[PDB]
Design a protein around this ligand. Structure first.
Ligand SMILES: C=C[C@H]1CN(Cc2ccccn2)C(=O)[C@@H]2CCC[C@H]1N2[S@@](=N)(=O)c1cc(Cl)cc(Cl)c1
Length: 128
């Protein structure tokens, strides 16, 4: 399925080149610009655990998730990954725990040592 495919066929987008965050672009977005640090980013997403469980989805809430890019409001992989996306892009990310919730996990939904899969759509970015 899609998690296996990004694991086996994704590109390493980390600065360290440690394969901690792999990406596939599913739908090419608009032009060349990506958001900058501090921008208000609007995304839709779905997240899955390695046991197959969908653990979260913004689509199911009928509202995007909004955050300020690069300010540590989200897991490291999101700050890294969303920064690579163009407006309108849809991407898959495969994230090792070191770029997510690590050995702690995040109770109740995220186990210890969890590799995470996301599908993310960048709706809009604005501001700083
Ligand atoms: C909807 C909440 C976000 C939670 N966070 C930030 C955060 C804040 C506080 C505690 C744990 N994580 C995050 O960094 C990431 C990425 C942005 C979307 C979503 N998560 S998430 N989908 O991984 C998620 C979803 C859910 Cl239901 C629980 C957790 Cl602990 C994490």
């Amino acid at each position: 399925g899609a998690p296996a495919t990004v694991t086996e066929q994704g590109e390493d987008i980390t600065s360290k080149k440690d394969r901690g965050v792999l990406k596939i672009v599913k739908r090419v977005g608009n032009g060349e610009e990506t958001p900058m640090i501090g921008d208000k980013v609007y995304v839709h997403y779905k997240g899955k655990l390695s046991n197959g469980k969908k653990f979260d989805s913004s689509h199911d809430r009928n509202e995007p998730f909004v955050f300020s890019l690069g300010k540590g409001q989200v897991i490291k992989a999101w700050d890294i990954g969303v920064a690579t996306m163009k407006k309108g892009e849809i991407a898959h990310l495969l994230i090792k725990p070191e770029y997510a919730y690590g050995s702690a996990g995040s109770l109740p939904k995220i186990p210890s040592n969890a590799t995470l899969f996301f599908e993310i759509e960048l709706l809009d970015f604005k501001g700083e």
